[PDB]
Each structure stands twice: as structure tokens, then as C-alpha cells.
Amino acid sequence: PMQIVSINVGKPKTIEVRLVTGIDKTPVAHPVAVGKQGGEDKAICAYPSEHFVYWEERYGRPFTAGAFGENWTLLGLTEDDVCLGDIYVAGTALVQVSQPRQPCSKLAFKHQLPDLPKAICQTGKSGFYFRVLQEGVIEPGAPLVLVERGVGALSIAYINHIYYHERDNAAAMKQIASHPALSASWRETFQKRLA
């Protein structure tokens, strides 16, 4: 009971500065190609559907698939159970956990909830990104099968906790920064801190 319950797709837009993808993504009912492409590290944004229950209770309104701008709405995989470096088979694709997802102002504007990013940081209900190790195709309801536990078994919950609360924990940061699966940007941040 670990799966992608929804694959959500958004519309591209250009800004004057480049092409960016919108935070508004709609659930689709058909197969979707999973391609490799900073951009690579954040290829797929994933969010645990379990947390929608909490958000509906906190804010008194619905939260359904796509509500956090996620490509993949997940079932059975929360931040406590998913580790940096975990490799999963999804459809014909292979994906690897690269970093926690940080809360952002686009999400606050989407829901018109200015305290939502703070709440995400306080609760740790953030979701996480995957990089794509092997391109393929997935369908809604696809199982996500763990094929390798990230070395060190460092959970996304643990990594968020160090990043947001233990900014003066040297041993913790060096260790996470040392992980070969960590996104370059998170590595850099842990190396700017630590100096």
C-alpha cells in the first residue's frame, strides 16, 4: 500500500528574466512519461496524501490531490519512513529521493493561507523530491516499490529537523552533506553553514 495515488500535471508559463511550471496541477487519468529533467535534483515533487487529513482539520476546507502543487500524490510514504537516497521503482521508471521540499509563498497564494508555509515548517508535513535515475512511464495507482534503502537511513523528517532546528549541529550537518544522494543546493547550504 505504497503507491502514487495521483499524478498531477500543470501548465507551463514564461516569466521575463525562462520557462517555469505552475504550482496549479490537475490529476490526470492516463499514462505519463517520467523524464530526467538543480532541475535534475528536483525532477518530481511528491506529497503524502495522509497529510491532507490534517490540513482539512486545521483549515476547515478540502485538500485533495494536487493541493500542494505535487507531481505525485503519494499513499503509504511519509517523511518519517522515506530516506535520503532511497531508490524506488515506479512503473517502468527508477527514482531516488534527493531532498525535502521547502514550503514556499506560491503555496500560500494558492490557498490564500499566509500561515501555511510556517505550518509546514512547524509540522514537518513537507513532502520531498525525487531525481529520475531511469526514465519511464507511470499510471495513476502505480505501486512505488523500494528497491534500495538510502545509505545511512536518514529520514526526510530527520533532515528537515536538522535544517530547521539544529542549525548549530556540526556532526549532523557534515553527515547529511556527505550523502552522495543529497541535492547540490542542500549540500551547499550545509557547507555555507559549517563555515
Author numbering: 0 to 16, 20 to 39, 53 to 210
From the primary publication:
The gsYiiM structure consists of ten β-strands and six α-helices and folds into a triangular shape that can be divided into three distinct structural modules, namely, a β-barrel, an N-terminal α-helix bundle (N-α-bundle), and a C-terminal α-helix bundle (C-α-bundle). gsYiiM possesses a cavity in the middle of its triangular architecture. Unexpectedly, in the Fo-Fc electron density map of gsYiiM, the sulfur atom of C119 exhibited an atypical triangular shape rather than a regular spherical shape that was observed for those of the other three cysteine residues (C60, C98, and C136) of gsYiiM. Considering the unusual shape and size of the electron density, the C119 sulfur atom is highly likely to have been oxidized to a sulfonic acid. Thus, the C119 residue was built in the gsYiiM structure as a cysteine sulfonic acid with good refinement statistics. The positive electrostatic potentials that surround the C119 residue would lower the pKa value of the sulfhydryl group at C119, and the deprotonated sulfur could readily make a nucleophilic attack on Moco for cofactor conjugation or on a substrate for the nitrogen-reducing process. In contrast, the α5-α6 loop of gsYiiM protrudes and makes significant steric clashes with the α5ʹ-α6ʹ loop in the dimeric organization, providing an explanation why gsYiiM prefers a monomeric form although the dimerization interface residues of ecYiiM are largely conserved in gsYiiM.
MOSC proteins play a key role in the Moco-dependent reduction of N-hydroxylated mutagens or prodrugs as a final electron transfer enzyme in the nitrogen-reducing system.
